[PDB]
Ligand binder design. Structure first.
Ligand code: 12Q
Ligand code: 12Q
Lengths: 158, 158
């Protein structure tokens, strides 16, 4: 009776932070969706510090503390995902965390670039994946935050 | 007495793999530089597999095996570093590996973009750093592979 109960936690990785509203609209939708399932969002801008290294360390700690990462690997400033988000996905992988990814554009890299090379003749990967192969770990690439969250609920029960 | 001797190893992270020559010219220079100090380069294309997941897993294992990562965070397809490289830097950070970075362009992000926002009004970070703040851990951002390697030799002796 009255045993400790773990509250599930998801790190909310993605470039929403660079939106004009600093991600408010995105994060508010995330907060509302997760609240219904008693899941805590760990959001990059929470209790934000002023120094770069402190912001970084707090985000790494959120990844260490999380049960899963849901990462927005949508195109950012071109066809490639955000590198900060990629760093966080790498952190999560090394820590053996559940990593779930989605993107607004699921086409293969070569379809995105329209060729096996970019405008500067640099090679575009040909593995039938929507982004750099380091970012794919065998879990389905989802089409939305919500679809990724459904996988979380099915595969990480309370 | 013939005790075991550790050979130092550096993971060679960066988008050279996408050069037309698949990074041969870059990796050859790395090999020659490291050979002089009896340091082993762990190069992403070594013993390369055919399946994406296998290539990824082998690269993660190289990061686990390394003493340091030297990461080329130069602009790739714009002002941002390569996301694969960023993933690898995050992997190394989570594993408490020495991470050393360089770039061909050390200007602050806002200098690179010429503004506090990009062409689509998305926020450009203002922390006096050359790239996404997750990629900076307090070690100097070097100007070349060689300068990073000099730091390695000074700070990770045989
Ligand atoms: C601006 N900013 C934040 O305000 C919070 C987290 C964060 C992480 C990576 C890059 C930039 C970030
Ligand atoms: C094409 N390719 C390789 O051939 C080898 C490693 C690797 C790592 C990330 C992304 C692409 C890669």
């Amino acid at each position: 009776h009255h045993h400790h109960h773990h509250m599930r936690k998801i790190y909310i990785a993605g470039p929403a932070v660079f939106n004009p509203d600093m991600g408010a609209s995105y994060y508010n939708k995330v907060r509302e969706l997760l609240k219904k399932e008693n899941v805590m969002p760990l959001i990059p801008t929470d209790n934000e510090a002023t120094e770069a290294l402190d912001i970084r360390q707090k985000n790494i700690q959120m990844i260490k503390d999380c049960d899963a990462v849901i990462a927005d690997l949508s195109p950012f400033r071109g066809h490639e995902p955000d590198c900060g988000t990629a760093f966080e996905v790498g952190c999560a992988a090394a820590l053996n965390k559940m990593v779930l990814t989605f993107t607004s554009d699921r086409r293969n890299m070569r379809e995105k670039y329209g060729s096996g090379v970019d405008k500067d003749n640099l090679r575009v990967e040909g593995f039938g994946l929507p982004f750099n192969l380091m970012l794919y770990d065998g879990v389905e690439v989802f089409d939305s935050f919500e679809s990724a969250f459904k996988y979380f609920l099915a595969n990480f029960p309370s």
